[PDB]
Amino acid sequence: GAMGSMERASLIQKAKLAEQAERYEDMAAFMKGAVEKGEELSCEERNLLSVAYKNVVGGQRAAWRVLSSIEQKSNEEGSEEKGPEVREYREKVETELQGVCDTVLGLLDSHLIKEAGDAESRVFYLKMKGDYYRYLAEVATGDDKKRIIDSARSAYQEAMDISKKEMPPTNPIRLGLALNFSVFHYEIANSPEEAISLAKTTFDEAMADLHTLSEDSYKDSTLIMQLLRDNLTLWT
């Protein structure tokens, strides 16, 4: 790896600089290099890894959606044929997106998940596994779409089981996991009722636990609860 010669601490320092400069591809490469040093990641370092790849794949997903929409219009009745270029370029972006997801999933499998023993780290990584399989599912169309969907579901489910046993209902990781699993149900699994049920139960159980929190933790938890509410308003 091109980062093999750089100190772990220097990679983390440069990831933070890249974030400030909005150089998210650089940030992801730095954090990949840090993971490949083989040591476990701290809470702050896990966040840096997530921020970097979220922004990289986020741009790819937005581009894929633009191109997919153009491609679908080109396949309507009365649409003048324009050749293979739209499909080709959508496939190009799709392949790069799949490559980023495979990279993240590879880091989780070698060997972040197996070393993660604490609930906070294990749930974080399993949520990430579900998220990146979900992004693969957004673009999947062939024989393996069902298996990709089940891989996302399985990761989210293991994360949910741990989070419910080991974390308070206001924990921001637990909340973000449930938010994302609910989006999976609605947008990927064709299960809108399950999505709505999960969002509502998650919100209500967090509401009942807010009284235990400091002002700062209260702000962290309510921010994610508002996203659950926003989705419920969209879906009902």
Binding site: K54, N55, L177, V183, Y186, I224, D230, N231
Partner: peptide
Amino acid sequence: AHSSPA
């Protein structure tokens, strides 16, 4: 729909 922020 909104998913979790980093």
